[PDB]
Amino acid sequence: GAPKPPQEPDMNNLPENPIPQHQAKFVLNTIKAVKRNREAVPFLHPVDTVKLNVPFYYNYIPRPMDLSTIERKINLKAYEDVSQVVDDFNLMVKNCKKFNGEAAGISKMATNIQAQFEKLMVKVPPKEL
Ligand SMILES: O=C1c2ccccc2Sc2cc(-c3noc(-c4cnccn4)n3)ccc2N1C1CC1
Ligand SMILES: O=C1c2ccccc2Sc2cc(-c3noc(-c4cnccn4)n3)ccc2N1C1CC1
Ligand code: NI
Ligand code: NI
């Protein structure tokens, strides 16, 4: 099957102007809140295709994503905008639905934590200032 993509973030391609700290603190706390959701447990760590016996996972999913990667990218200043945090969360969810199917129980878990994430993000402070 397709090989495992490199871990994010690319430490040689970090942005010159990352998310401002007041937004970075908020999205970090937002991800940590989602990580405490019981529905988030299977999303805490990258898919391990050996443990799960899916040799063709990366053929479906060329850009895997998980909550720990989002947290790491926030901490390592890899994001330029909070829209990219939203994008990565949506990518994690879309990956799950693409590989497992929309009707799978794991995809309902993904939808549930996406709904929590979206509700929490209502209160993100604006970028300017
Ligand atoms: O995409 C998948 C995926 C990919 C291939 C096959 C199934 C799944 S579903 C899935 C399950 C897990 C998992 N972690 O632990 C256990 C477990 C299961 N029973 C007993 C003990 N532990 N399952 C982690 C990630 C995960 N995800 C990612 C969308 C989350
Ligand atoms: O038989 C199966 C089985 C049944 C159906 C589909 C796949 C598998 S393979 C399999 C994986 C898991 C699992 N535990 O943690 C994770 C994980 C994966 N990535 C990230 C984080 N965590 N996967 C547990 C039990 C397990 N087993 C039992 C033989 C062990
Ligand atoms: Ni292979
Ligand atoms: Ni704004």
| 3-state secondary structure (DSSP) of residue 34 | helix
Give burial (CB, 10 Å; 0-12/13-18/19+) of 17: exposed
Alpha-carbon distances of 109 from 84, 114, 123, rounded to whole Å: 22, 9, 23
Identify which of 52, 54, 61 to mutate to test ligand 2's pocket (most ligand atoms within 8 A of the CB): 52
Name residue, tokens 């099957």.
1
Q: φ and ψ at 82, to 5 degrees? A: -65, -20
Give the H or E element holding residue 73: helix 67-75
How far does the centroid of ligand 2 lie from the alpha carbon of residue 57, in Å? 14
- CA-wise closest residue to 61 among 25, 98, 36: 98
Determination technique used: X-ray
The whole-angstrom separation of Cα 93 and Cα 128 is 29
Enumerate the domain spans of the chain. Answer: 21-124
Stated resolution in angstroms: 1.8
Instruction: Determine the angle formed by the axes of helices 67-75 and 82-100, rounding to 10 degrees.
Output: 160
Can you say whether the dihedral through the CA atoms of 4, 101, 71, 10 is positive or negative? Answer: positive
Note whether 15 and 79 are within 8 A (CB).
Answer: yes
Q: Could you tell me which CATH number the domain at 21-124 has?
A: 1.20.920.10
